[PDB]
Design an enzyme around this catalytic site. Sequence first.
Site, PDB file in Angstrom:
ATOM      1  N   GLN A 185       0.857  -1.183   0.000  1.00  0.00           N
ATOM      2  CA  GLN A 185       0.000   0.000   0.000  1.00  0.00           C
ATOM      3  C   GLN A 185       0.893   1.233   0.000  1.00  0.00           C
ATOM      4  O   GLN A 185       1.503   1.562   1.023  1.00  0.00           O
ATOM      5  CB  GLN A 185      -0.940  -0.002   1.206  1.00  0.00           C
ATOM      6  CG  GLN A 185      -2.055   1.028   1.130  1.00  0.00           C
ATOM      7  CD  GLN A 185      -3.091   0.847   2.222  1.00  0.00           C
ATOM      8  OE1 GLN A 185      -2.797   0.317   3.292  1.00  0.00           O
ATOM      9  NE2 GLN A 185      -4.317   1.282   1.950  1.00  0.00           N
ATOM     10  N   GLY A 186       0.971   1.911  -1.145  1.00  0.00           N
ATOM     11  CA  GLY A 186       1.806   3.077  -1.306  1.00  0.00           C
ATOM     12  C   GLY A 186       0.997   4.328  -1.610  1.00  0.00           C
ATOM     13  O   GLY A 186      -0.237   4.321  -1.610  1.00  0.00           O
ATOM     14  N   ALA A 187       1.729   5.411  -1.874  1.00  0.00           N
ATOM     15  CA  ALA A 187       1.086   6.689  -2.158  1.00  0.00           C
ATOM     16  C   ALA A 187       0.506   6.724  -3.567  1.00  0.00           C
ATOM     17  O   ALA A 187      -0.590   7.256  -3.776  1.00  0.00           O
ATOM     18  CB  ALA A 187       2.081   7.833  -1.962  1.00  0.00           C
ATOM     19  N   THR A 188       1.223   6.161  -4.542  1.00  0.00           N
ATOM     20  CA  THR A 188       0.747   6.192  -5.921  1.00  0.00           C
ATOM     21  C   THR A 188      -0.421   5.235  -6.124  1.00  0.00           C
ATOM     22  O   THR A 188      -1.460   5.614  -6.678  1.00  0.00           O
ATOM     23  CB  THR A 188       1.890   5.855  -6.881  1.00  0.00           C
ATOM     24  OG1 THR A 188       2.915   6.852  -6.778  1.00  0.00           O
ATOM     25  CG2 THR A 188       1.385   5.801  -8.318  1.00  0.00           C
ATOM     26  N   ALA A 189      -0.275   3.991  -5.677  1.00  0.00           N
ATOM     27  CA  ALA A 189      -1.285   2.971  -5.918  1.00  0.00           C
ATOM     28  C   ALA A 189      -1.141   1.876  -4.868  1.00  0.00           C
ATOM     29  O   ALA A 189      -0.261   1.924  -4.004  1.00  0.00           O
ATOM     30  CB  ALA A 189      -1.162   2.407  -7.336  1.00  0.00           C
ATOM     31  N   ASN A 190      -2.025   0.885  -4.950  1.00  0.00           N
ATOM     32  CA  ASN A 190      -1.992  -0.289  -4.093  1.00  0.00           C
ATOM     33  C   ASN A 190      -1.932  -1.541  -4.957  1.00  0.00           C
ATOM     34  O   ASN A 190      -2.521  -1.595  -6.041  1.00  0.00           O
ATOM     35  CB  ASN A 190      -3.217  -0.346  -3.171  1.00  0.00           C
ATOM     36  CG  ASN A 190      -3.377   0.908  -2.335  1.00  0.00           C
ATOM     37  OD1 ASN A 190      -2.403   1.597  -2.034  1.00  0.00           O
ATOM     38  ND2 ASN A 190      -4.614   1.212  -1.954  1.00  0.00           N
ATOM     39  N   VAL A 191      -1.215  -2.550  -4.470  1.00  0.00           N
ATOM     40  CA  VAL A 191      -1.001  -3.794  -5.201  1.00  0.00           C
ATOM     41  C   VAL A 191      -1.768  -4.903  -4.496  1.00  0.00           C
ATOM     42  O   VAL A 191      -1.547  -5.162  -3.306  1.00  0.00           O
ATOM     43  CB  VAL A 191       0.493  -4.137  -5.310  1.00  0.00           C
ATOM     44  CG1 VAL A 191       0.682  -5.445  -6.063  1.00  0.00           C
ATOM     45  CG2 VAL A 191       1.245  -3.007  -5.997  1.00  0.00           C
TER      46      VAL A 191
ATOM     47  N   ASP B 113      15.226   5.464  -6.242  1.00  0.00           N
ATOM     48  CA  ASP B 113      14.974   4.898  -4.920  1.00  0.00           C
ATOM     49  C   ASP B 113      15.188   3.390  -4.985  1.00  0.00           C
ATOM     50  O   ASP B 113      14.454   2.684  -5.683  1.00  0.00           O
ATOM     51  CB  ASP B 113      13.562   5.231  -4.446  1.00  0.00           C
ATOM     52  CG  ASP B 113      13.188   4.504  -3.168  1.00  0.00           C
ATOM     53  OD1 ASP B 113      13.778   4.812  -2.109  1.00  0.00           O
ATOM     54  OD2 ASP B 113      12.301   3.626  -3.219  1.00  0.00           O
TER      55      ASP B 113
HETATM   56  C1  LIG Z   1       5.792 -15.416   3.255  1.00  0.00           C
HETATM   57  N1  LIG Z   1       4.720 -14.410   3.535  1.00  0.00           N
HETATM   58  C2  LIG Z   1       5.055 -13.755   4.836  1.00  0.00           C
HETATM   59  C3  LIG Z   1       4.570 -13.396   2.398  1.00  0.00           C
HETATM   60  C4  LIG Z   1       4.335 -11.909   2.877  1.00  0.00           C
HETATM   61  C5  LIG Z   1       3.226 -11.072   2.126  1.00  0.00           C
HETATM   62  C6  LIG Z   1       3.402 -10.868   0.586  1.00  0.00           C
HETATM   63  C7  LIG Z   1       3.286 -11.928  -0.332  1.00  0.00           C
HETATM   64  C8  LIG Z   1       3.440 -11.779  -1.708  1.00  0.00           C
HETATM   65  C9  LIG Z   1       3.734 -10.528  -2.301  1.00  0.00           C
HETATM   66  O1  LIG Z   1       3.880 -10.431  -3.672  1.00  0.00           O
HETATM   67  C10 LIG Z   1       4.206  -9.204  -4.280  1.00  0.00           C
HETATM   68  N2  LIG Z   1       4.357  -9.254  -5.652  1.00  0.00           N
HETATM   69  C11 LIG Z   1       4.680  -8.048  -6.288  1.00  0.00           C
HETATM   70  N3  LIG Z   1       4.845  -8.044  -7.665  1.00  0.00           N
HETATM   71  C12 LIG Z   1       4.853  -6.814  -5.594  1.00  0.00           C
HETATM   72  C13 LIG Z   1       5.208  -5.526  -6.391  1.00  0.00           C
HETATM   73  O2  LIG Z   1       5.402  -5.660  -7.613  1.00  0.00           O
HETATM   74  O3  LIG Z   1       5.263  -4.461  -5.756  1.00  0.00           O
HETATM   75  C14 LIG Z   1       4.682  -6.850  -4.231  1.00  0.00           C
HETATM   76  C15 LIG Z   1       4.351  -8.048  -3.510  1.00  0.00           C
HETATM   77  C16 LIG Z   1       4.169  -8.129  -2.063  1.00  0.00           C
HETATM   78  O4  LIG Z   1       4.272  -7.136  -1.340  1.00  0.00           O
HETATM   79  C17 LIG Z   1       3.858  -9.445  -1.424  1.00  0.00           C
HETATM   80  C18 LIG Z   1       3.694  -9.632  -0.021  1.00  0.00           C
END
Ligand SMILES: CN(C)CCCc1ccc2oc3nc(N)c(C(=O)O)cc3c(=O)c2c1
Length: 604
Positions: A18-24, A126
């Site tokens: 959950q960021g400022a630009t968008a949420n994933v 960053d």
């Molecule tokens: C092992 N347990 C403690 C996993 C923790 C929670 C989790 C799981 C999968 C995720 O998969 C993501 N996949 C992405 N592509 C991006 C991005 O591109 O920003 C960000 C994430 C996550 O934050 C994420 C968190």
Amino acid sequence: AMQSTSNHLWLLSDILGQGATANVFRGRHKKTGDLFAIKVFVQMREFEVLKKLNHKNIVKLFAIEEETTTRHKVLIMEFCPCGSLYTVLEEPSNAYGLPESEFLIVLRDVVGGMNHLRENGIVHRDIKPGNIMRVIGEDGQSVYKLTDFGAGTEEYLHPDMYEDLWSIGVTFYHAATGSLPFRPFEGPRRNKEVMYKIITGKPSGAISGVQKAENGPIDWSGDMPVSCSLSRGLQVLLTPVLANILEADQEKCWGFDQFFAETSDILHRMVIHVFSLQQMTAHKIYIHSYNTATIFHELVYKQTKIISSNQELIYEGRRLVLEPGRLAQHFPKTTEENPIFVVSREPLNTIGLIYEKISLPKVHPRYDLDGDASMAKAITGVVCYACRIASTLLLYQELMRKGIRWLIELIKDDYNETVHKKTEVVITLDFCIRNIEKTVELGEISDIHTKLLRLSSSQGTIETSLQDIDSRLSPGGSLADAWAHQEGTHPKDRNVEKLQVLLNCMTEIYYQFKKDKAERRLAYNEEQIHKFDKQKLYYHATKAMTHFTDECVKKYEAFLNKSEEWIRKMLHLRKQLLSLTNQCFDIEEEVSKYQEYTNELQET
Ligand SMILES: CN(C)CCCc1ccc2oc3nc(N)c(C(=O)O)cc3c(=O)c2c1
């Protein structure tokens, strides 16, 4: 209730970042069921150019779709179930630094990822552990990828930007030490002006700055902390890389070319495990596969202060002679449990393992979901450190027993070779002292017996002093290795696992407190479970530290003190056997001056 697309759908509860630009969000495909990373918010061109970006260290941007209800541009990205590098650093096992093998994977992926971005011309601006995801590869090893670089973080800013290679050095230091390089007292919050003063202090060579008192000084340091779980040979190569990329002077900045060159130099080096048996210290020599053994002995000296000519190496119960031109890739493969033991004829100080002695932080009675979470994280990482040192102290003792049990056999091999040269002198002595008696103006003969009987007498004194050493290398002969089996800790005691049982209980309470912090408040029933398990968190940590110091450390220091005495007695016996063997070579040639002298007269 949930949002959908023509090909994907995701629940709002399965929210990832959950960021400022968008949420994933964590979403799936409507036709296959495969999991994807759904990101819900000039663009149509800069997004399609990110699709063709295919690299192992870059999150693949699959497609760009538009949501059904709000018609928002949705990015379909690669799903990384393990989380980000920040998630990895939040675990208590990595509270004081990543594992050394895991640290090399991060550096290889980060460098390999940005290099591909520089080939295409994308500046990351960053670069933090939150921007580095973790994926399990097909072989089981982690694979780190970059993802968020479109339009950074307060702790990873350049001093001029605070008002590219900077945040990379902070991430590597954080991954190696488990902590930030520049930390004020009350953290980078209200002491934000102190944080800027710490960076503008630019000590050049130093890489750390800890303010251990409110509005106090800044404890600088140029080396890694003692709690760093990396090998001493890796810290020597990692320190200059960070120090030259952690100063505001562009005149003194390295740049990516010198950065990519020196980092590639580290990754192209193989590991040679070497255990100093006289110092009771394990080491890791980072040497290229094309270097010679002469450079290998140089790196052993720079890490053990042992002279290259005095380095006598043992491997798999036998002596090891390294040719000065033998390449490193032809060395025998070594592990942490089967290294190349190095011993020297010069007396060496017995040091042992050096580690940071940390105590348990006091637990507060205040019912604070955020306070108990930050408290549980620190106290569980301390037990991980004590559990890490416990296994290292066990490995040192087990490596000590094998090295001692091998060295006594190597000495018994030197003793048996002396017997071979003794039988060569005894046979020559008897066949020459009696061949004269057969043939027997006589002073030419009487002077021989006054010299032959002196040889047989001095040779006999070697025999008596040799059988004494044979009595010393016998079981119970004031040099037996039986004390090593009856002093320190053993895998039979199972001390590392006894601490690891209490560690899992503290980690589950920590993970539960980590979930209790996300919930803003708990019910009356769940509140008392949070308080009851908080008291159990203290009893588990107290029980582990008691078993660690009153059993693991006491037996280790008793084994270490016993080892320092046996090393002296071993160095004393080696000097006698060497002298006794040298007393067999010089008399082997002294009987050579008389076997050809009078035994072969001249006459036609
Ligand atoms: C092992 N347990 C403690 C996993 C923790 C929670 C989790 C799981 C999968 C995720 O998969 C993501 N996949 C992405 N592509 C991006 C991005 O591109 O920003 C960000 C994430 C996550 O934050 C994420 C968190």
